[PDB]
Write a protein that binds this ligand. Structure first.
Ligand SMILES: [Ca+2]
Ligand SMILES: [Ca+2]
Length: 124
């Protein structure tokens, strides 16, 4: 009923997307359009999405959730300590869907560190 996809296993995109080791094994998104994405098979259309990550500092980091090219919501991190952020009851298509995690709100004040994406609901 839950599946976890490590961000470091996803396909990198953008200018500077890179791997990090601390505060967890994961990926850093440093600027706008820095992203990771992968193909998620879905047998049904409604899931909760939880991203574990954090800012690199005390400023608020944000990561956008995209599915099938549609922006479905934004994960927010109010500091540098690793935390989960859940976006509940996201509707989306079935079959193979491209899940994208992308920075769009960078302004030179923070980087987004992302550990894993957890998807909850009706068969992991
Ligand atoms: Ca940045
Ligand atoms: Ca990870």
């Amino acid at each position: 009923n839950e599946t976890i996809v490590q961000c470091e296993s996803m396909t990198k995109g953008g200018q500077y997307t890179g791997n990090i080791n601390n505060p967890f094994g994961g990926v850093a998104l440093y600027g706008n359009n820095d992203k990771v994405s992968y193909t998620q098979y879905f047998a049904s259309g409604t899931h909760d999405f939880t991203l574990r990550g954090c800012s690199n500092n005390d400023n608020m980091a944000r990561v956008d959730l995209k599915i099938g090219g549609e922006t479905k919501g934004t994960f927010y991190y109010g500091g540098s300590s690793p935390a989960e952020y859940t976006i509940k009851n996201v509707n989306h298509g079935t079959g193979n869907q491209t899940i994208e995690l992308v920075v769009t709100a960078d302004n030179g004040q923070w980087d987004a560190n992302i550990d894993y994406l957890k998807i909850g609901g009706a068969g992991v």
